[PDB]
């Protein structure tokens, strides 16, 4: 409760695939479509993906700038203390990567 609940309890997105909590974002959808949760690490820039079978519609997402991506849809949410995000962030400044193994796969 204190660490749990007072402390900085936070439901956060992880990529089940790369195990990060820092490389997810909400997609920005066309009007009428619904936003989804995606991993910037695990997905290809749309161009590069074409340059290597047909690509399904549910597999493309876009950001605010406008770039299109393929893949990176293996996300969920986990409950972590917020300060974990800060630590992970600082560590990546130092070139260090934390990789959280999430279950179920």
């Amino acid at each position: 409760d204190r660490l749990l609940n007072s402390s900085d309890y936070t439901q956060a997105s992880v990529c089940r695939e790369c195990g990060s909590i820092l490389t997810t974002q909400q997609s920005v959808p066309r009007i009428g479509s619904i936003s989804t949760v995606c991993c910037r690490r695990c997905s290809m820039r749309f161009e590069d993906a074409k340059k290597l079978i047909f690509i399904d519609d549910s597999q493309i997402w876009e950001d605010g700038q406008g770039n299109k991506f393929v893949g990176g849809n293996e996300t969920t949410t986990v409950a972590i203390p917020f300060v974990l995000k800060y630590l992970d962030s600082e560590l990546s400044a130092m070139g260090i990567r934390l990789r959280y193994n999430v279950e179920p796969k």
Partner: protein, 46 residues
């Protein structure tokens, strides 16, 4: 000495198995001591 032990962990490509009280507090996991030392299951009929 946080950065020293961290440097050591990285160079070992260590996995934190998350069993110690400290580690579980770090990741927000229920402690391994106590009322947490067993699981509860419900007996359901039908």
């Amino acid at each position: 000495t946080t950065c020293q032990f961290l440097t050591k962990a990285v160079l070992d490509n260590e996995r934190e198995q998350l069993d110690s009280p400290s580690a579980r507090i770090v990741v927000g996991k229920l402690n391994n001591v106590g009322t947490g030392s067993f699981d509860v299951l419900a007996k359901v009929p039908n």
